[PDB]
């Protein structure tokens, strides 16, 4: 099945809680500003040397699924980390946990990683749905990837 | 309309063999799926087994003096009581046309 | 000529057969006269395998998504015993076909332009001014995955990726050349 990326991203803040991106910057998050019928305009934020960097991006909705009835991905042009595509492949029952395939290409190297993203400020003593985190842990074990959390409670 | 009923069909260059005779309906002839029939005394023999495409013929020679030419090849829907691939009726041919060069194409 | 003797019992138990009668000189012409006999009973018809058809999607039990990753899943395809009738034989062999796969289904990849394919067939055959085509295709850079064994078993790439290459002559996926087929013979039906 295919969960709608246009529904998941129509929320105020989406935080990256866990990722296999090599050496990710701290406090990676997306803040929706205005979604259209075929694309969403949003602000991608992250911390570098204590400085908040903001990219104003447009993600054009597309389909990675076979039925081509529910949007589940976005193409992004000019993202500063080279991310050109994102594919939403799982959303939790409480709709607070989402699993992403991220495709990036920067100077003749195209790479892939995965994210766990939360549709709101994560909580301290409330873990995400066990199926959501378990599929990601199984991916990490099956690929011999190193996982890191970009999120901290001090993120603005 | 009575047909000619044969006991054998020859999978290669499809031809009827082992004539029983000529006063029978197709239904009775093809009660035995190993059998084959003919419309009238010397035309196309259709086997009674379910329709399926025949093997492509060998490539016919290609019309050239010395240059590049072209050549044809064919196959036929052969059988009875049904249809071959692509909702096609028994007897219908399919053709393929290939470019050809006999010599160095002088 | 004596009288025609009786017709022998039909020698087949289904479909048509040939029964003869004989005569004795008690004489020019036929001592024997054959006839077709109808049993009116249909013979058995053995079933025959259909074609395999398309592969099911590449999936791993208890993994929602494998695409674009070096994670074997597995796939199956089926075929149906068709036409078995009036007590004919059932089909022999495996009904289901199974294999291990890597999913590159809908994975956007960097591409490079392939070399030219060979010229296709002349289309339409027998039609007016038949022309043939060849194409240059945007091929994604295929990953170097190991064909090892998840037991020693094969793992096949499966799925249609979305390759990204620089545009060549105004096209992003397929560049096509046509060329007439020349000196076309005519399709004389052999009957
Ligand atoms: C007599 O009873 C019939 C029901 C059939 O089972 C006969 O066998 C059939 O004999 C013909 C040969 O004329 C074959 O074409 C069939 O394949 C075979 O099943 C049986 O002799
Ligand atoms: C024609 O095409 C190929 C041989 O060229 C085979 O699959 C088969 O002979 C078919 O009838
Ligand atoms: C036609 O094409 C070639 C002959 O050059 C062979 O593969 C075969 O004879 C086919 O029928
Ligand atoms: C055979 O043909 C008929 C019987 O059907 C008769 O004219 C005669 O018995 C002949 O021998
Ligand atoms: C036998 O066949 C017929 C008789 O019915 C005649 O042509 C002739 O008597 C021959 O001996
Ligand atoms: C199934 O297996 C292959 C197709 O991949 C062929 O030999 C044939 O189509 C068969 O039905
Ligand atoms: C599935 O596997 C490949 C496609 O990747 C083909 O051999 C065929 O389509 C089969 O059904
Ligand atoms: C397209 O494919 C590659 C670039 O992706 C190059 O070989 C060349 O630019 C070609 O036109
Ligand atoms: C196709 O055309 C010619 C050779 O046929 C070359 O320029 C090159 O191989 C291209 O792929
Ligand atoms: C197209 O033209 C020649 C002659 O037919 C072929 O041999 C070759 O495959 C090329 O692609």
Numbering used by the authors:
A (entry chain C): 48 to 203
B (entry chain A): 28 to 133
C (entry chain B): 260 to 285, 296 to 419, 425 to 465
Text from the published report:
We chose to work with a minimal properdin construct that had previously been used to determine the crystal structure of pseudo-monomeric, minimal functional unit of properdin (hereafter referred to as FPΔ2,3). The addition of CirpA1 to purified FPΔ2,3 results in a distinct shift of molecular weight, as measured by SEC-MALS, indicating the formation of a complex at 1:1 stoichiometry. We were able to obtain crystals from the FPΔ2,3-CirpA1 complex and determine its structure to 3.4 Å by X-ray crystallography. CirpA1 binds properdin at TSR5 and 6, in immediate proximity to the convertase binding region. Analysis of the interaction surface, which is burying 864 Å2, reveals complementary charged patches, suggesting that binding is mediated by electrostatic interactions. In CirpA1, properdin binding leads to structural changes in the three C-terminal beta strands, as well as specific rearrangements of individual amino acids contributing to complex stability. One example is Q148 which forms a hydrogen bond to properdin Q338. Another CirpA1 residue undergoing a conformational rearrangement upon properdin binding is Y122 which forms a hydrophobic pocket around properdin P377 together with CirpA1 residues F122, Y131, and F150. In context of the properdin bound C3 convertase, binding of CirpA1 results in a steric clash between CirpA1 and the protease component Bb. We, therefore, rationalise that binding of CirpA1 impacts the conformational freedom of the stirrup loops thereby destabilising the interaction with C3b and possibly preventing conformational changes required for binding to the convertase.
In this study, we identify a family of complement inhibitors from the hard tick Rhipicephalus pulchellus, hereafter termed CirpA (Complement inhibitor from R. pulchellus of the alternative pathway). Functional and structural characterisation reveals that members of the CirpA family directly bind to properdin, inhibiting its ability to promote complement activation, and leading to potent inhibition of the complement response in a species specific manner. Whilst many molecules act to control inappropriate activation, Properdin is the only known positive regulator of the human complement system. All CirpA structures share a lipocalin fold with a short N-terminal α-helix followed by an eight-stranded beta-barrel and a longer C-terminal α-helix.
